[PDB]
Amino acid sequence: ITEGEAKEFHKIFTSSILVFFGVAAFAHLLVWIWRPWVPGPNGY
Amino acid sequence: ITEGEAKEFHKIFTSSILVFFGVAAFAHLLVWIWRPWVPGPNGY
Amino acid sequence: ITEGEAKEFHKIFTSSILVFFGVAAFAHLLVWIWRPWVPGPNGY
Amino acid sequence: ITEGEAKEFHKIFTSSILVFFGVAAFAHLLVWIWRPWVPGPNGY
Amino acid sequence: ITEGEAKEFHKIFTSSILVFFGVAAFAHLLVWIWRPWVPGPNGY
Amino acid sequence: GITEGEAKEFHKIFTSSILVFFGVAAFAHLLVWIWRPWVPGPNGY
Amino acid sequence: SEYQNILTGVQVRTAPHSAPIAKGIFPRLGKPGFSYWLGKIGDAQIGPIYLGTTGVLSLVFGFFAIEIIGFNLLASVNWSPMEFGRQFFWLGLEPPAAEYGLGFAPLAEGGWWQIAGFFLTTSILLWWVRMYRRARALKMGTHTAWAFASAIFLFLSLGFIRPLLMGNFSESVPFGIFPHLEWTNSFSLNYGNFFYNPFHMLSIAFLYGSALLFAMHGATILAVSRLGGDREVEQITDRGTAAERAALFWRWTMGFNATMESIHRWAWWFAVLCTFTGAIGILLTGTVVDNWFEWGVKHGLAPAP
Amino acid sequence: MWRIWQLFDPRQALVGLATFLFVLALLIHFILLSTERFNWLEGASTK
Amino acid sequence: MWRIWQLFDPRQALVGLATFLFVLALLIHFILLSTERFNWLEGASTK
Amino acid sequence: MWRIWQLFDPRQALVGLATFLFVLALLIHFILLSTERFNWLEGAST
Amino acid sequence: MWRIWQLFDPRQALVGLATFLFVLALLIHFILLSTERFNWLEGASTK
Amino acid sequence: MWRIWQLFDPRQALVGLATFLFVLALLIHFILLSTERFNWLEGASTK
Amino acid sequence: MWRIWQLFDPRQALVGLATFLFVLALLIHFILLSTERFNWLEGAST
Amino acid sequence: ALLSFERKYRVRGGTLIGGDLFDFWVGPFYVGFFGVTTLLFTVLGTALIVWGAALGPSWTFWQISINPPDVSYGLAMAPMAKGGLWQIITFSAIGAFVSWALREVEICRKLGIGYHIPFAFGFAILAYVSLVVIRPVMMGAWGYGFPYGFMTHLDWVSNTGYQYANFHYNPAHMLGITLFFTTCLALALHGSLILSAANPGKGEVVKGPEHENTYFQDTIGYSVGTLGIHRVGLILALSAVVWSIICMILSGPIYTGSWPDWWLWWQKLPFWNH
Amino acid sequence: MNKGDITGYMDVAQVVLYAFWIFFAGLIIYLRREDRREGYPLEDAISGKINSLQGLGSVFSIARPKIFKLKTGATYAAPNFKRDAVAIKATRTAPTAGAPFEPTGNPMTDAVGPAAYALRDELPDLTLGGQPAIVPLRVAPTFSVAAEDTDPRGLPVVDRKGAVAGKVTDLWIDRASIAIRYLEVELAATPGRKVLLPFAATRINAKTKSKTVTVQSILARHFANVPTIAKTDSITRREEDKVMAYYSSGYLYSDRV
Ligand SMILES: CCCCCCCCCCCCCC(=O)OC[C@H](COP(=O)(O)OCC(O)COP(=O)(O)OC[C@@H](COC(=O)CCCCCCCCCCCCC)OC(=O)CCCCCCCCCCCCC)OC(=O)CCCCCCCCCCCCC
Ligand code: 07D
Numbered sequence A, B, C, D, E: 001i002t003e004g005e006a007k008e009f010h011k012i013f014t015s016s017i018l019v020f021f022g023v024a025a026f027a028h029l030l031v032w033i034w035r036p037w038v039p040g041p042n043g044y
Numbered sequence F: 001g002i003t004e005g006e007a008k009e010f011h012k013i014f015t016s017s018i019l020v021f022f023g024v025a026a027f028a029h030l031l032v033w034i035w036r037p038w039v040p041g042p043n044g045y
Numbered sequence G: 001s002e003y004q005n006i007l008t009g010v011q012v013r014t015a016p017h018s019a020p021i022a023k024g025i026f027p028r029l030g031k032p033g034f035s036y037w038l039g040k041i042g043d044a045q046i047g048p049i050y051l052g053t054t055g056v057l058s059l060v061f062g063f064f065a066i067e068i069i070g071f072n073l074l075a076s077v078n079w080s081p082m083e084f085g086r087q088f089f090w091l092g093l094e095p096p097a098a099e100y101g102l103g104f105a106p107l108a109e110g111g112w113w114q115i116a117g118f119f120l121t122t123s124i125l126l127w128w129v130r131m132y133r134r135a136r137a138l139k140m141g142t143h144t145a146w147a148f149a150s151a152i153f154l155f156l157s158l159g160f161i162r163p164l165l166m167g168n169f170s171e172s173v174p175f176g177i178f179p180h181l182e183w184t185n186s187f188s189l190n191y192g193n194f195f196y197n198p199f200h201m202l203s204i205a206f207l208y209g210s211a212l213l214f215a216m217h218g219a220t221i222l223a224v225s226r227l228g229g230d231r232e233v234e235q236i237t238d239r240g241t242a243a244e245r246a247a248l249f250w251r252w253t254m255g256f257n258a259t260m261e262s263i264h265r266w267a268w269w270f271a272v273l274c275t276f277t278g279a280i281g282i283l284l285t286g287t288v289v290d291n292w293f294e295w296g297v298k299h300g301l302a303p304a305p
Numbered sequence H, I, K, L: 001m002w003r004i005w006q007l008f009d010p011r012q013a014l015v016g017l018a019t020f021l022f023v024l025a026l027l028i029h030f031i032l033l034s035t036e037r038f039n040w041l042e043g044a045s046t047k
Numbered sequence J, M: 001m002w003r004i005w006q007l008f009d010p011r012q013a014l015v016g017l018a019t020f021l022f023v024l025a026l027l028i029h030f031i032l033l034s035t036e037r038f039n040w041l042e043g044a045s046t
Numbered sequence N: 001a002l003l004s005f006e007r008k009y010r011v012r013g014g015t016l017i018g019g020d021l022f023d024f025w026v027g028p029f030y031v032g033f034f035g036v037t038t039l040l041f042t043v044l045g046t047a048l049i050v051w052g053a054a055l056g057p058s059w060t061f062w063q064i065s066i067n068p069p070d071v072s073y074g075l076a077m078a079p080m081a082k083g084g085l086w087q088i089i090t091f092s093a094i095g096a097f098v099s100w101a102l103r104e105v106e107i108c109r110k111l112g113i114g115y116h117i118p119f120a121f122g123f124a125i126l127a128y129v130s131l132v133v134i135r136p137v138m139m140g141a142w143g144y145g146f147p148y149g150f151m152t153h154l155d156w157v158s159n160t161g162y163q164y165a166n167f168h169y170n171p172a173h174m175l176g177i178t179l180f181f182t183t184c185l186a187l188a189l190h191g192s193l194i195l196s197a198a199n200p201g202k203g204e205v206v207k208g209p210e211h212e213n214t215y216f217q218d219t220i221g222y223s224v225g226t227l228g229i230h231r232v233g234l235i236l237a238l239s240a241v242v243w244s245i246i247c248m249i250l251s252g253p254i255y256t257g258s259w260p261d262w263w264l265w266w267q268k269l270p271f272w273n274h
Numbered sequence O: 001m002n003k004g005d006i007t008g009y010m011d012v013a014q015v016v017l018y019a020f021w022i023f024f025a026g027l028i029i030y031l032r033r034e035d036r037r038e039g040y041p042l043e044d045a046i047s048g049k050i051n052s053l054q055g056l057g058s059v060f061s062i063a064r065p066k067i068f069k070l071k072t073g074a075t076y077a078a079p080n081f082k083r084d085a086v087a088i089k090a091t092r093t094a095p096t097a098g099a100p101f102e103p104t105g106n107p108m109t110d111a112v113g114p115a116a117y118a119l120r121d122e123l124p125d126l127t128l129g130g131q132p133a134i135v136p137l138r139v140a141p142t143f144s145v146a147a148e149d150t151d152p153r154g155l156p157v158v159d160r161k162g163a164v165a166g167k168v169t170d171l172w173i174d175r176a177s178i179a180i181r182y183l184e185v186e187l188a189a190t191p192g193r194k195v196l197l198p199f200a201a202t203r204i205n206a207k208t209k210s211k212t213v214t215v216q217s218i219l220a221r222h223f224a225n226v227p228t229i230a231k232t233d234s235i236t237r238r239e240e241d242k243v244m245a246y247y248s249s250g251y252l253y254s255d256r257v
C-alpha cells in the first residue's frame, strides 16, 4: 500500500468508524431510556 | 526494522496504551462507585 | 548474542523485573492487610 | 564447551543452586514453625 | 570411550553412589526412628 | 562379535557380579525368614 | 523377512512446495516445518495452512463456542482448578429443560448451551464451506465436502433437527465427556433399546464395513506397494500390474473385484452411509417410533414378550 | 495513525474486524434474549 | 521501551495482543455475570 | 549472571516468560476465587 | 563435578531443570492444598 | 567394572538412571501416602 | 561357560537381565503387598 | 470367464500344501487345498445352523438362535441338543476362517504380492476366537460365548455390557470406539481425496500427488501422503480391533465390578483428593 | 398406538427402511458398473472369445466410457476395451478352462506369472511442473537424504544367501511424492553394468559396522537379467512396471531359475 492510498483508506476508515460509533451510541441511549441496565442497591 | 521505525511505532504505541489504560481506569472508577469489590470483615 | 548486547539487555531486564516484583510486593501487602493467609492454631 | 568454560559455568551454577537451597531451607523452617509435618504417636 | 576416560568417569560415579546411598541410609534411619516398618507378631 | 579373551574378561566380571547379587539376596531372604517364615506348618500359620 | 513397507527407512528432503492457487485476501500461513517421525509414517512436511475469510469466520465462531463451554465447565466447579481437574470428565453443559421449548432459556438454565450450540453449528457449517472451496481452488472435485455433509447431518440430527421435531431441546446432547456418553445410554433406554432400531443396525453395518474396507484396502495397497500401487491416481489413468494384481487377488479370493478408482467409491459410500443411516434412525426415534423393541416384536425381530 | 495501513493489509483488517463485530453483536443480542428483563420479544414486566 | 520493536514484529505483536486482551476481557465479563453481586443483567439486590 | 543472555535468546525468553507468568497468575486468581475466605466477588464474612 | 558440563549442554540442562523443578513444586503445593492440616487458604484448626 | 562405561555411554546411562530413580522415588512416596501408618501429611495415630 | 558371551551380545544380556529382574522383583514385592501375612506396610497380626 | 488381463497371471505353483492336485480355478474362484477345507467347514457349520433352526421354535430368520451350553457345563462338551451344537459350529467356523486365511496366502504367493491381507484378516479371526474361546475359557464356561443368532447376539452384547453397570466406562472400550470412529473418518477422507483428484470436474485435468498433498495442507496443515494413508488406515483398523479384544479380556476374566466405579481412582489422586 | 401407522400393519419406519433397500440395491448396481471399467467384458479362458454367464442385468453391467483428461493433453478411456493377447509363453497343465499354465521357458525373462507386467505408457510420470517425476539424485540437486538416516550410496547389495550383487551408486527419487523409488546398483559381475533395484524390495542391515542393502527377492545371479531402461536419467511407466514385476517374481521363481 502506498502512502497516498493508505491515507485515503484512513480517511474512509475514520469516517465510517465514527459513524458506526455514532449510530451505536444513539442505539444505547434509546435502550437506556426504555430499560436501564445498571441496577440500584435494591436491584431493579 | 530501523530505530526510527521502532521509535515511530513506540510513540504511537505509548499514546494508544495510555489512552486504553485511561479509559479502563475511568471504567473501574465508575464500577467501584456503583458497587465496590473488596468486602469488609462482615462481607458486603 | 554479543557480550555488549547481553550486558545491555541485562540492564533493562534488571530494571523491569525489579519493578514487577516491587508492584507484586505492594499487592501482597495490601491483600495481607485486607485478609492474611497464614491461619493460627484455631484456624482463622 | 571448553574445560574453562565448563569450570566457569560450574561456578555460577554452584552459587545459584546454593542460593536456591538456602531460600528453600528458610521456607521449610518457617513452615515447620507454623505447622510441623512429622506426627507423634498420638498423631497430630 | 578410552580407558582413562572410562576410569575417570567411574571414579566420580563411585563417589556419587556413596553420597547418594549415604544420604538415603540416613533418611531411612530417621524414618525408622519415627515409625519402623517391620511389624511384630501382634502387628503394629 | 567379541574375541575370546574379551568374552573371558566379561565372564570374570559377570561371575563376580552375579555371586554378589545372589549373596545380598540370600542375606535378604534370611532376614525375612527370621521375621516371618513362608513355609506353613501342618496347622497353617 | 522382506520389507513390509510399514515404516519409511530412508526418507528424503527438498525445498517445501505446494500447488498454486489464485491470490486471495490471505496468503498461506506459517513456515513449513519437517518432523522425522511423521516422515517415517508418511510425508514429513508440517506444511503451511490456508486461512481465508471462511477460515476466519469458522475459527471465530468455533472459538466463542469453545470458550462458552470451557468457562461454564470451570464455573460449575466454582472456578477451582483442582476440582476442575478432579471432575473434568464428569463436568458438562446441559441443554434447557423441556418447558422452554425452542425459545431462549435463561443463561444458567441452558441458555449458554443454546448459544454454544448455535456458535458451534455455525462454525462447523463454515468449515464445510472451507472444505468445499479449497477443492474448487485446487480445481479438484468436491467429494470431501459431500462426505463431510453426511457427518454434519448426524450432528445436526442429534443436536437440533430432532429437537425441532420434538418441539424442545431437553433430549439434545450435553457438552461433556461422560455426560454425552450418559446421554447415549439414557437415549437408548428411554426409547426401548437402540439395538432394535434397524437404522442403528444399518449404521453399525457400515461402521464395521468401513473398518473392514480400510483393513482390506490398506493391506491391499501395501501388498502391491513393491509394484507401485501406492501411486493410485497414476494407476487409475494408466493401469499398471499393481492394479491388475490387486484386482485378481480379490477376484480369485471372493469371486469379484473393484478397480483402483471404484474401490474409493466403495470406501466413500460406506463411511457416508454409516452417518446417513444413523441420522435417519435418530430422526425416526420418538417422532414415529416410541419403543424400538416393541416395533421389533411387531416386525418379527423378537418373540412377543 | 494512517501508518497502520502500511503495516497491515486493509482487506485483512476489514475482514477480521467485520467478522469480530458481527459475532460479538450476535452474541450480545442472544445474551439479552436469554434474560428476563431485556428479552424484548417475551416482554416480561419491570416488577 | 522502544528496542522491543526491534526484537518483535509489530504485525505479530498487535494481533497477538488484541486477541489476548479480548479473551481476557470476555473472561472477566463472564465471571461477573456468574456472580450475584455483579451480574448487571440479572440485577440482584444488595440486602 | 548477564551471561544467561549469551546462553538464551531474549526473544524466546520473553515470550516464554510472559506466557508462564500469565498462566501462573491466572491459576492463582482462579484458586482464590474458589475459596470461601478469598473470593472477593462473593465476599463471605470472617 | 564441573566435568558434568562436558557431559551435558548447559542450555539443555537449565531448561530441563527449570521445567522439572516447577512441575515438582506445583505438585507439592497441590498435594498440601488437598490436606486438611496444610491447606493454608482454608485454614482448618489443629484440633 | 569401569569397563561398564566402555559398554554404555555415560551420558545416556546417567539420564536413564536419573529418570528411573526419580520415578521409583516418586512411586514409593505415593505408596506411603496411601497407607494409614506412613501418610505423614494426614498423620493417623499409632493406636 | 564364557563362550555364552560369544553366543550372546553382553550389552543385550545386561539390558535384558536388568529389565527382567526389575520387573520380576517389582512383581514379587506387589504380590507380598497383596497378602495379609507379608504386607509390611499394613502389618496385620500373625 | 476371465478378465482382459487375467490369463498371463494364472500360473501353476504357490500352494502351501497338496501340490498340483488342487491348483485350479472354478470360474473366478481359486480353489487350492484350503478352498476344499473352507467348503468342508462351511457346509458343515451352515447345515448345523440350519439344523439348529429346525430344532428351534421359529423359522423367522431374525429370531433363529443357536445357543452355547449352560454355564453349569463349565468347559465340558455338552450334549448336542443342550449346547453341543454351538460347540461344533464354533470349531467348524474356526476351521473355515483359518482355511480362508491360508487360501489367501496361496493367492498372494501365486501373484508375488505381500501377505498383508491374510495377516490383517488374522486380527478378525483373533477377535472372534477371543469372544468364543479365550474369554469363556478364562471365565471357566463355554456359556459365556455369544449365541449364533441375528438378534440374540445383540441381546448377548446388551446383557454383557450392563453386567458391568455401564460398558461406556470401560477405558479400553473408549479407546476401541475412538479408533473405530477415526477409521471411518480416515476412510471418508481417503475415498474423497482420490475421487476428487481423479474426478476434478468437467473441463479439468486429473490432479496428482502435489495437489493431493496441498489439499490437506491447505485445509488442516498436514498431509500424510499417498503411502502413509494406507499405513495409517490399516493400523487404525487393526488397533481398533486389538483394543476391542483387550476391553473384553478385561471385562470378566480380570475385572468383575462396575466400570463407572473403576474411574474413582482418578478423583482420589493426592494432588486433588480434598 | 396409531402414531406411526401407514396401514393396519404397515408403518413409517418400515416404509423408510424399504426405501433404503431400494436405494442401496441401486447403489450396488452403480458401484458394480464402476468396478467394470477395467478388465471387462469377460472372455472364455481357452479361446479368448467374449463370453461369460450373464443375466438380463448384462444390459446395465458395463458403463459408457468415461474420459480422463491428462495434463499432457492426452486422454485415457475407461473402459477402453483394450485386452491382452490370447497367446502367452506358457501352456496349460491340463486342457480344462480352469487349469493353470506352466511357463514354456524362463518365466522371469518371458514375463509370465508374477513376472508379468502391464503394457503401460512408454511415458514417464510427470511432476506438476511437467518435468519427469522419477530421476536420479545426480539430476535432482535440490533433494537430499535426511541427516538422521543412512544414505544407501556406496553400500554393498547382498542377496538372502549372502552373495554380493554389487554396490549402490545412485538413488532415484520421486519429485512428485518425495520418496526414494529405486536404487541404481553397479553389478559386481560385468563391472560397469548398472541396474535399477526397487527400494521397497530392499532393507538396510546395520547390525554390523559394514552395513549393507539386503535383497530378499532375487539372488545375485539374477541381477544380470534385470530389465534395462532406454534413458540414463528418466524411466517410463512401462519400464517401471517391467523392472518391478521382475523382482516381484523372485519369491516364486528365483530358486527355480
Ligand atoms: C459351499 C459354501 C457356499 C457358501 C456361500 C457362498 C455364497 C456365494 C456363492 C459362491 C459361488 C458362486 C459361484 C459362481 O457364481 O460361479 C459362476 C461361474 C460362471 O460365471 P462366469 O462365466 O465366469 O461369469 C460370471 C460373471 O459374468 C458375473 O459378473 P461379474 O464378473 O461382474 O461378477 C462376479 C460375481 C461373482 O459373485 C460371486 O461369486 C458371489 C459373490 C459373493 C456373494 C455374497 C453374498 C452374501 C453376503 C451379503 C450380500 C449382501 C448383498 C446386498 O460378483 C458378484 O456378484 C459380487 C456382488 C457383490 C455385492 C457386494 C455387496 C456388499 C454389501 C455388504 C452388506 C452391507 C449391509 C448394509 O461358474 C462356473 O464357471 C461353473 C462352475 C461353478 C458353478 C457354480 C454353481 C453354484 C455354486 C453355489 C454355491 C453354493 C451356494 C449356497
Ligand atoms: C435390477 C435389474 C436387473 C434384474 C433383472 C436383476 C435381477 C436379479 N438379480 Mg441382479 N438384476 C439386474 C441387474 C443387475 N444385477 C446385478 C448383480 C447381482 C448379483 C450381486 C449383487 C447383489 O448383491 O445384488 C443385490 C441386489 C440388487 C443389485 C438388485 C437386484 C437383485 C434383486 C432384487 C434380488 C435380491 C434377492 C435375493 C434373494 C438375493 C439374491 C442373491 C444375492 C444378492 C447373492 C446377485 C447374484 C444378483 C441377483 C439377482 C437376482 C436373484 C435377480 C432376480 C430375482 O431376478 N444380481 C450384480 C453383480 O455383480 O452381478 C454379477 C450387478 O452388477 C448387477 C446388475 C447390473
Ligand code: 07D
Pocket (backbone or CB within 6 Å): G066, G120, G124, G151, G152, G154, G155, G158, G175, G183, G184, G185, G187, G188, G193, G194, G195, G199, G200, G203, G204, G205, G207, G274, G275, G277, G278, G279, G281, G282, N157, N181, N184
Ligand atoms: C447403551 C448404548 C446404546 C447401545 C444399544 C448401542 C451400541 C452400539 N452402537 Mg450405537 N448404541 C446405543 C445408543 C446409540 N447409538 C448411537 C449411534 C451409533 C452410530 C454412530 C455413528 C457415528 O459416526 O457417530 C460419530 C459421528 C458423529 C456423532 C457425527 C460427526 C461429528 C461431528 C460433525 C462433530 C465435529 C466435531 C467438532 C468440529 C469438534 C467440536 C468441539 C467440541 C464440541 C468441544 C454407530 C454406528 C453406533 C455403533 C454402536 C456399536 C458398534 C454398538 C455396540 C457394539 O454395542 N452407534 C448414533 C446413531 O447414528 O444412532 C442411529 C446415535 O445417535 C446413537 C445412540 C443414541
Ligand code: 07D
Pocket (backbone or CB within 6 Å): G184, N097, N124, N125, N127, N128, N131, N156, N157, N158, N159, N160, N161, N162, N166, N167, N168, N173, N176, N177, N180, N241, N243, N244, N245, N247, N248
Ligand atoms: C449395552 C451394550 C454396551 C454399550 C454401552 C456399548 C456401546 C458402544 N460400543 Mg461396545 N457397547 C456395549 C457393550 C459391548 N461392546 C462391545 C464391543 C465393541 C466393539 C465392536 C467391534 C469389534 O470388537 O469388532 C471385532 C470383530 C470381530 C469379532 C470380527 C468377526 C468377523 C470375522 C471373524 C469374519 C466372519 C465372517 C463370516 C462369518 C463369513 C460369512 C459369509 C459371507 C460374508 C459370504 C467396538 C469398539 C464397540 C463400539 C461401541 C460403540 C461405538 C458404542 C456406542 C456408540 O454406544 N464395542 C465388542 C468387543 O470389544 O469385542 C471384542 C464386545 O464384545 C462388546 C460389548 C459386550
Ligand SMILES: CC[C@H]1c2cc3[nH]c4c(c3C)C(=O)[C@H](C(=O)OC)c4c3nc(cc4[nH]c(cc(n2)[C@@H]1C)c(C(C)=O)c4C)[C@@H](C)[C@@H]3CCC(=O)OC/C=C(\C)CCC[C@H](C)CCC[C@H](C)CCCC(C)C
Pocket (backbone or CB within 6 Å): G058, G059, G060, G061, G062, G063, G064, G066, G123, G124, G125, G127, G128, G131, G144, G145, G147, G148, G150, G151, G271, G272, G274, G275, I019, I022, I023, N181, N182, N184, N185, N188, N189, N219, N220
Ligand atoms: C462420514 C462419517 C465420518 C466423518 C467424516 C468427516 N469428518 C470430517 C470430514 C469428513 C469427510 C471433513 O472434511 C472434516 C475435516 O476437516 O476433516 C479433516 C471433518 C471433521 N470431523 C471432525 C470431527 C469428528 N468427526 C467424527 C466422525 C466422523 N467424521 C464420521 C465417522 C467425530 C466423532 C465423534 O466420531 C468427530 C469428533 C473435525 C476434526 C472436522 C471438522 C472441523 C470443524 O468443523 O471445525 C470447526 C471449528 C472449530 C471446532 C473451532 C476451533 C477454534 C480454535 C481453538 C481457534 C484457535 C485459533 C484462532 C485464530 C483464535 C481466535 C480467537 C479470537 C476469535 C478471540
Ligand SMILES: CC[C@H]1c2cc3[nH]c4c(c3C)C(=O)[C@H](C(=O)OC)c4c3nc(cc4[nH]c(cc(n2)[C@@H]1C)c(C(C)=O)c4C)[C@@H](C)[C@@H]3CCC(=O)OC/C=C(\C)CCC[C@H](C)CCC[C@H](C)CCCC(C)C
Pocket (backbone or CB within 6 Å): G208, G211, G212, G215, G216, G219, G253, G254, N038, N041, N042, N043, N044, N045, N046, N089, N090, N092, N093, N096, N097, N100, N117, N118, N120, N121, N123, N124, N147, N148, N149, N150, N151, N153, N237, N238, N241
Ligand atoms: C481386523 C480388522 C477388520 C476386518 C478385516 C478383514 N476381514 C476380512 C479380511 C480382512 C483384512 C479379509 O481378507 C476377508 C475377506 O475375504 O474379505 C472380503 C475378511 C472377511 N471379513 C468378513 C466379515 C466381517 N469382518 C468383520 C470385521 C473386521 N474385519 C474388522 C473390523 C465383521 C464384523 C465386525 O461384524 C464381519 C461380519 C468376511 C466378509 C470375510 C471372511 C470370509 C470368510 O471367512 O469366508 C469363509 C467362511 C465362510 C464363507 C462361512 C463360514 C460359516 C461358518 C462355518 C459358520 C459361522 C457362524 C458364525 C460363528 C455365527 C454367525 C451368526 C451371526 C448373527 C453372529
Ligand SMILES: COC1=C(OC)C(=O)C(C/C=C(\C)CC/C=C(\C)CC/C=C(\C)CC/C=C(\C)CC/C=C(\C)CC/C=C(\C)CC/C=C(\C)CC/C=C(\C)CC/C=C(\C)CCC=C(C)C)=C(C)C1=O
Pocket (backbone or CB within 6 Å): G209, G212, G213, G216, G217, G218, G220, G221, G243, G246, G247, G250, G251, G253, G254, G255, G256, G257, G258, G259, G260, G263, G266, N026, N027, N029, N030, N031, N034, N035, N036, N038, N039, N040, N042, N043
Ligand atoms: C486396490 O483396490 C482393491 C481392489 O481391486 C482393484 C478390490 O477389488 C478390493 C476388494 C473390495 C471390493 C471389491 C469392495 C466390496 C467388498 C466389500 C464391501 C467387503 C465385503 C464382502 C462381501 C460382502 C463378499 C462376501 C463373499 C465372500 C466371502 C465369498 C463367498 C464365496 C465362497 C465361500 C466360495 C469360495 C470358493 C471356493 C473355496 C472354491 C470354488 C467353489 C465354488 C465356486 C463353489 C462351490 C464348489 C463347487 C461347486 C465345486 C467344488 C467343491 C469341492 C471340491 C468340495 C465338495 C465338498 C463339499 C462339502 C462342498 C480391495 C480391497 C482393493 O483394495
Ligand SMILES: COC1=C(OC)C(=O)C(C/C=C(\C)CC/C=C(\C)CC/C=C(\C)CC/C=C(\C)CC/C=C(\C)CC/C=C(\C)CC/C=C(\C)CC/C=C(\C)CC/C=C(\C)CCC=C(C)C)=C(C)C1=O
Pocket (backbone or CB within 6 Å): N182, N185, N186, N189, N190, N191, N193, N194, N212, N213, N216, N219, N220, N222, N223, N224, N225, N226, N227, N229, N232
Ligand atoms: C491420498 O492420500 C491422502 C493424503 O495425502 C495426500 C492425506 O494426507 C490424507 C489426510 C490424512 C491425514 C493427514 C492423516 C489422517 C490420520 C488420522 C485420521 C489418524 C490420527 C488423527 C488425526 C490426524 C486427527 C484428524 C483431525 C484433524 C487433523 C483436525 C482437523 C480440524 C481442524 C484443524 C480444526 C478443528 C479441530 C482442531 C483444532 C483439533 C481437533 C482435535 C484433535 C485433533 C484431537 C486432540 C486431542 C484431544 C482433544 C484429547 C482426547 C483424549 C483425551 C482427553 C484422553 C487421552 C489424552 C490425550 C492427550 C490423547 C488423506 C485422507 C489421503 O487420502
Ligand SMILES: CCCCCCCC/C=C/CCCCCCCC(=O)O[C@H](COC(=O)CCCCCCCCCCCCCCC)COP(=O)(O)OC[C@@H](O)CO
Pocket (backbone or CB within 6 Å): N061, O053, O054, O055, O056, O057, O058, O059, O061
Ligand atoms: C427359464 C427356463 C429355464 C432354462 C434356463 C435354465 C439354465 C439357466 C439358469 C440360470 C440361473 C442360475 C445361475 C445363476 C447365476 C448366473 C449369473 C447371475 O449372477 O445371475 C443372477 C442371479 O445370480 C444368482 O442368483 C446367484 C445366487 C448365488 C447364491 C445363492 C445362495 C442360495 C442359498 C442361500 C439362500 C438363503 C440365504 C439367507 C437369506 C436370509 C441373475 O441375473 P443378473 O442379470 O442379475 O446377473 C448379473 C449379471 O447379468 C451382471 O453382468
Ligand SMILES: COC(C)(C)C/C=C/C(C)=C/C=C/C(C)=C/C=C/C(C)=C/C=C\C=C(C)\C=C\C=C(C)\C=C\C=C(C)\C=C\CC(C)(C)OC
Pocket (backbone or CB within 6 Å): G066, G067, G069, G070, G071, G073, G102, G103, G104, G105, G114, G115, G117, G118, G121, G155, G156, G158, G159, G160, G172, G173, G174, G175, G176, G177, G180
Ligand atoms: C481457553 O482455554 C481453553 C481452550 C483450555 C478453555 C477450555 C476449554 C475446554 C476445556 C472445553 C471443553 C469442552 C468439552 C469437554 C466438550 C465436550 C463436548 C462433547 C463431548 C460434545 C458431544 C456432542 C454434542 C452435540 C452433538 C451437540 C450438538 C448441539 C447442537 C447442534 C445445537 C444446536 C443449537 C441451535 C442451533 C440452537 C438454536 C436456538 C436459537 C439459538 C436460534 O434460539 C434459542
Ligand SMILES: [Cl-]
Pocket (backbone or CB within 6 Å): G003, G004, G005, G006, G007
Ligand atoms: Cl517394516
Ligand SMILES: [Fe+3]
Pocket (backbone or CB within 6 Å): G217, G221, G232, N190, N194, N230
Ligand atoms: Fe487408496
